[PDB]
């Protein structure tokens, strides 16, 4: 039932629209991240953080293009890294919000529904896109100017040693699906337009957009992945997986909130966590 008809031409036009918007919204694509990770890039190598010495050298070398005040710098290494992650998460929320506004029909939704979809959506999208920046050894940071090792992150004192490991475990399995940016543009759109998010006023309009994104995604995967007939079904399970990874992350933050009372959680992230 794969046919070239006006319906399929419209679904290919939607896929290209989303790809083009995704390129504009997300500075470091998966294509450029893989080229850095394999060394295939002509770019200067990222600075590698693999121990305490290289962490402190990296803090001098990596132009984080972000102000960490004296009171934050005074914090121990684990809290500095965690506060860095929190800062990047807030930036990612901004990028994902600009991408969502490019999804046809999204800006026409009630502004409260746009905020709800983004509130419940953004962490699922952050873990999806973080996989693009990961291999089994570590994760690219600071728009690919740095690379932090998986074992260096595991070595941070409890509870900080556990926060990234679940994202690496998700990423190694997700990356084995070999999605490209063209696939991910549509996958992320599908997740954002989830009609079962709590406190949505107008469900039917979101479901109607999502159904069309799901058709565009299924057609993209069939064209772009002749090596697998399972990939669409496998991505539907990744969507359900992501909700449980976010649950787990929120529970970790609660432990951090209770047992590390000193520490400062970003007020914008606190708002999002309120009802996850
Ligand atoms: O890509 C990003 O920038 C955010 S994502 C991310 N992920 C990890 Cl695992 C660490 C990190 N920030 C960081 C990594 C080293 C050290 C560190 O220390 C505080 C930042 C800082 C900035 C300037 C001078 C000194 C310290 C923070 N950021």
UniProtKB/Swiss-Prot annotation:
Cell compartments where the protein resides: Nucleus; Cytoplasm
Primary subcellular site in the record, as a coarse category: nucleus
Gene Ontology cellular component annotations, sorted alphabetically: chromatin; cytosol; intracellular membrane-bounded organelle; nucleoplasm; nucleus; receptor complex; RNA polymerase II transcription regulator complex
UniProt keyword terms in alphabetical order: Activator, Biological rhythms, Cytoplasm, Diabetes mellitus, Disease variant, DNA-binding, Glycoprotein, Isopeptide bond, Metal-binding, Nucleus, Obesity, Phosphoprotein, Receptor, Transcription, Transcription regulation, Ubl conjugation, Zinc, Zinc-finger
Region (Interaction with FAM120B): 3-52
UniProt PTM comment: Phosphorylated in basal conditions and dephosphorylated when treated with the ligand. May be dephosphorylated by PPP5C. Ubiquitinated by E3 ubiquitin-protein ligase complex containing FBXO9; leading to proteasomal degradation. Ubiquitinated at Lys-24 by TRIM55 leading to proteasomal degradation. Ubiquitinated by E3 ubiquitin-protein ligase STUB1/CHIP; leading to proteasomal degradation.
Residue span, NR LBD domain: 10-275
Record motif 9aaTAD, residues: 267-275
Tissues showing expression: Highest expression in adipose tissue. Lower in skeletal muscle, spleen, heart and liver. Also detectable in placenta, lung and ovary.
Binding site for rosiglitazone: 86-89, 123, 249, 273
Family according to the record: Belongs to the nuclear hormone receptor family. NR1 subfamily.
Domain statement: The 9aaTAD motif is a transactivation domain present in a large number of yeast and animal transcription factors.
Subunit structure: Interacts with FOXO1 (acetylated form). Heterodimer with other nuclear receptors, such as RXRA. The heterodimer with the retinoic acid receptor RXRA is called adipocyte-specific transcription factor ARF6. Interacts with NCOA6 coactivator, leading to a strong increase in transcription of target genes. Interacts with coactivator PPARBP, leading to a mild increase in transcription of target genes. Interacts with NOCA7 in a ligand-inducible manner. Interacts with NCOA1 and NCOA2 LXXLL motifs. Interacts with ASXL1, ASXL2, DNTTIP2, FAM120B, MAP2K1/MEK1, NR0B2, PDPK1, PRDM16, PRMT2 and TGFB1I1.
Name by which UniProt lists this protein: Peroxisome proliferator-activated receptor gamma
Organism whose genome encodes this protein: Homo sapiens
């Amino acid at each position: 039932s794969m046919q070239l008809n006006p319906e399929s031409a419209d679904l290919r036009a939607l896929a290209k629209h989303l790809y083009d918007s995704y390129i504009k919204s997300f500075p470091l694509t998966k294509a450029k991240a893989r080229a850095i990770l394999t060394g295939k890039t002509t770019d200067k190598s990222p600075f590698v953080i693999y121990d305490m010495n290289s962490l402190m050298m990296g803090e001098d070398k990596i132009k984080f293009k972000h102000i960490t005040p004296l009171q934050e710098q005074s914090k121990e290494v684990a809290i500095r890294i965690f506060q860095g992650c929190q800062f990047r998460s807030v930036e990612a929320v901004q990028e994902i919000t600009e991408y969502a506004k490019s999804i046809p029909g999204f800006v026409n939704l009630d502004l409260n529904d746009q905020v709800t979809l983004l509130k419940y959506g953004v962490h699922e999208i952050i873990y999806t896109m973080l996989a693009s920046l990961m291999n089994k050894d570590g994760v690219l940071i600071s728009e690919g100017q740095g690379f932090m090792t998986r074992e260096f992150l595991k070595s941070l004192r409890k509870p900080f040693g556990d926060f990234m490991e679940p994202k690496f475990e998700f990423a190694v399995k997700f990356n084995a699906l070999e999605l490209d940016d063209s696939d991910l543009a549509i996958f992320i759109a599908v997740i954002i337009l989830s009609g079962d998010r709590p406190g949505l006023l107008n469900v039917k309009p979101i479901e109607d957009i999502q159904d069309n994104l799901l058709q565009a995604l299924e057609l993209q995967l069939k064209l772009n992945h002749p090596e697998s007939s399972q990939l669409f079904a496998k991505l539907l399970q990744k969507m359900t997986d992501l909700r449980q990874i976010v649950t787990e992350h929120v529970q970790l933050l609660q432990v951090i909130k209770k047992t590390e009372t000193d520490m400062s959680l970003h007020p914008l992230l606190q708002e999002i966590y309120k009802d996850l």
